[PDB]
Symmetry: C4
Subunit: 102 residues, 4 copies
């Protein structure tokens, strides 16, 4: 029952990926397309990419989400849902994207 | 259907409070999720009929919230419940966030 | 083809106000939701420009659990009427203290 | 296999942006006519290539935001772009709310 969660918080950009069936080959493709590597950590198993020097405005956030969706679509992961919040105290926004296999 | 069968899972943090609503939700599916999420139980309340679990002691950071959502979605997928939509808000006054997950049969 | 129209249902709390937009929404569907949502009964009223139906639940406050129940009953009721849930989003307004959720539906 | 599309709407005042590598100008012009009608031009900018409309100097209330979303979704569906997901946030300091709609062929 393979699902994937991608979470993106801004700014600066921090992208997390969770899903037991996620391949390192897929992580590498997103590394290359999100225009600086994803580092793996266990418990829970996940990939993290932080771009500490970068600032993404609203349009660039839209662009990051498209590259993630498109990259994952080519690798057999289908977008099923998204949600987002903003934290007034930190000034950060966090978006989650949820994917499933076909 | 009576009301064609859908499910709503809502999760508020922190501390974690998980609620599960849906006419066709069986107690056996609630018991499977009880095991995956973590020895805390869902309690049943009526009107609206639903199951509530509170992890009074626990604190979930963003990564662990993502993990909770993923475990809920994967456990429900195996039970025949497909994720259709999600939404979320944060309350600045309380510092709590609430995410809702909507599921339908396959 | 064009294809079929879409539906947007929005709900703001509190107090609970439900609005429904969509050219192809039939009165029979509104009437079914009138009966399902509260569970003198409250009604949807029609207003033009933009054309929509509006219901307020009678001065209530709906806790987070009751908000989940309203959304489920809307989705379930519309699914039986041939409207399929495609997307949802929500925001909270810190200054009014109100939260708004949108549900978007397409024909099957 | 195909590029996806993101339409973002921020209020107020209402500003609509469209981002998608495969978006045709006829689609943009169709929305250009449908949006003010449901409630002036989309202008092209680079880096990344996108389309931007300042729909009005007048403020949209919640009902008119609903109506903008619906007219966008309906117009894009007729052009072969299917709604897959949405998300939204509100910024308390700026007082602006931003909604993103994601579409696929
Ligand atoms: Cl959302
Ligand atoms: K969806
Ligand atoms: Mg959503
Ligand atoms: Mg939100």
């Amino acid at each position: 029952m393979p699902n994937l969660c991608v979470s993106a918080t801004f700014n600066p950009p921090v992208i997390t990926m969770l899903g037991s069936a996620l391949r390192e080959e897929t992580v590498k493709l997103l590394e290359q397309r999100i225009p600086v590597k994803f580092l793996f950590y266990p418990n829970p198993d996940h990939w993290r990419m932080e771009l500490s020097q970068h600032f993404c405005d609203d349009l660039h956030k839209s662009a990051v989400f498209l590259t993630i969706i498109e990259g994952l679509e080519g690798e057999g992961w289908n977008l099923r849902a998204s949600n987002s919040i903003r934290d007034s105290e930190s000034g950060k926004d966090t978006t989650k994207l949820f994917f499933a296999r076909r």
